[PDB]
Amino acid sequence: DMRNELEEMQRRADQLADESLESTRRMLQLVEESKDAGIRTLVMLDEQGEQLERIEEGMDQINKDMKEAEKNLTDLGK
Amino acid sequence: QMGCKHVKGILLYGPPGCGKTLLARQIGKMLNAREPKVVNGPEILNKYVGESEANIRKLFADAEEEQRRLGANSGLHIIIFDE
Ligand SMILES: Nc1ncnc2c1ncn2[C@@H]1O[C@H](COP(=O)(O)OP(=O)(O)OP(=O)(O)O)[C@@H](O)[C@H]1O
């Protein structure tokens, strides 16, 4: 009558982490810095676009003025 | 008014082949109630510590909930233990 039976106990392997808290924090800090740099680039790019738009009008005005002056001088000369 | 409680148990015994399971089945199908639970022999045992008692506890979980909710207007819950 040496017929034995058993029961079982369970253990849980550690969840997936303990490497997600050293590279993670550095990743977040770098992401924040990149976000700030992107915001600054946004602002600078908008300012540059405004300045180019401003330049356009003066360019067109000088072109028109020179063309009209040349035509007038030619007309009077002949 | 009589202030009495209801019976909650029946036992049938005798020699083989004399009609015990038939009577239980016909009783089960005679009552306008839920679908009776059936336990076929040692169907509850489990090898993990504390897992063969949760099986016992699980059979009364609907009766307890309905008793808590509806009080004295609840239906009837049948349970059958074979062997
Ligand atoms: N009183 C009875 N009237 C009609 N048929 C019966 C009766 N008793 C037994 N039988 C017949 O016997 C069959 C099997 O009997 P049953 O399974 O009810 O016996 P049992 O007492 O559960 O036996 P066991 O001891 O093996 O559990 C039923 O399906 C039925 O056909």
UniProtKB/Swiss-Prot annotation, chain A:
<feature type="region of interest" description="Interaction with CENPF">
    <location>
        <begin position="1"/>
        <end position="70"/>
    </location>
</feature>
<feature type="compositionally biased region" description="Basic and acidic residues">
    <location>
        <begin position="1"/>
        <end position="15"/>
    </location>
</feature>
<feature type="domain" description="t-SNARE coiled-coil homology 1">
    <location>
        <begin position="14"/>
        <end position="76"/>
    </location>
</feature>
<comment type="similarity">
    <text>Belongs to the SNAP-25 family.</text>
</comment>
<protein>
    <recommendedName>
        <fullName>Synaptosomal-associated protein 25</fullName>
    </recommendedName>
</protein>
<feature type="region of interest" description="Disordered">
    <location>
        <begin position="1"/>
        <end position="18"/>
    </location>
</feature>
<comment type="subunit">
    <text>Part of the SNARE core complex containing SNAP25, VAMP2 and STX1A;this complex constitutes the basic catalytic machinery of the complex neurotransmitter release apparatus. Recruited to the SNARE complex following binding of the SNARE complex component STX1A to STXBP1. This complex binds CPLX1. Found in a complex containing SYT1, SV2B and syntaxin-1. Found in a ternary complex with STX1A and VAMP8. Interacts with HSC70 and with SYT9, forming a complex with DNAJC5. The interaction with SYT9 is inhibited in presence of calcium. Isoform 1 and isoform 2 interact with BLOC1S6. Interacts with CENPF.</text>
</comment>
<comment type="function">
    <text>t-SNARE involved in the molecular regulation of neurotransmitter release. May play an important role in the synaptic function of specific neuronal systems. Associates with proteins involved in vesicle docking and membrane fusion. Regulates plasma membrane recycling through its interaction with CENPF. Modulates the gating characteristics of the delayed rectifier voltage-dependent potassium channel KCNB1 in pancreatic beta cells.</text>
</comment>
Swiss-Prot record, chain B:
<comment type="subunit">
    <text>Homohexamer. Interacts with GABARAP and GABARAPL2. Interacts with GRIA2. Interacts with PLK2, leading to disrupt the interaction with GRIA2. Interacts with MUSK; may regulate MUSK endocytosis and activity. Interacts with CDK16.</text>
</comment>
<comment type="similarity">
    <text>Belongs to the AAA ATPase family.</text>
</comment>
<feature type="modified residue" description="Phosphotyrosine">
    <location>
        <position position="13"/>
    </location>
</feature>
<protein>
    <recommendedName>
        <fullName>Vesicle-fusing ATPase</fullName>
    </recommendedName>
</protein>
<comment type="function">
    <text>Required for vesicle-mediated transport. Catalyzes the fusion of transport vesicles within the Golgi cisternae. Is also required for transport from the endoplasmic reticulum to the Golgi stack. Seems to function as a fusion protein required for the delivery of cargo proteins to all compartments of the Golgi stack independent of vesicle origin. Interaction with AMPAR subunit GRIA2 leads to influence GRIA2 membrane cycling.</text>
</comment>
